[PDB]
Amino acid sequence: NKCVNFNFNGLTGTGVLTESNKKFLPFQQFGRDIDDTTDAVRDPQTLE
Amino acid sequence: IANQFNSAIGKIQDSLSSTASALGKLQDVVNQNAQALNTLVKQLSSNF
């Protein structure tokens, strides 16, 4: 809930990060929409 | 004149409701506008 730059596992981006109701399968790490733009990420330590 | 008119208004509900595709003239511009925003964004992936 802050504007931050980020790097997750080498994936670099920017935005407001927040808790998600979505559920990736155990082997997906980054979400991409229709636009092929990165809308969500699994945190590599809390795994949420 | 009233009963023909009531039966005539009657079918105008049904042509929309039963989905005769006639709203295509609006749908097709909502699609044609959207396909351009999708196209515009997607080119940012290209190496040029």
Ligand SMILES: *[C@@H]1O[C@H](CO)[C@@H](O[C@@H]2O[C@H](CO)[C@@H](O)[C@H](O)[C@H]2NC(C)=O)[C@H](O)[C@H]1NC(C)=O
């Ligand atoms: C990395 O380490 C942290 C803690 O050192 C792990 O977080 C713990 O996860 C368990 C199970 O969910 C919780 O019961 C603990 O409360 C968590 N720790 C803390 C300090 O709250 C985390 O799971 C580890 N990551 C991996 C991938 O193993």
Ligand SMILES: *[C@@H]1O[C@H](CO)[C@@H](O[C@@H]2O[C@H](CO)[C@@H](O)[C@H](O)[C@H]2NC(C)=O)[C@H](O)[C@H]1NC(C)=O
């Ligand atoms: C003119 O056409 C109308 C149809 O729009 C006729 O009205 C029908 O009349 C029959 C009996 O002959 C009724 O069973 C139908 O229910 C009527 N239809 C409607 C929509 O009400 C009318 O009889 C015709 N009259 C002439 C003189 O041709």
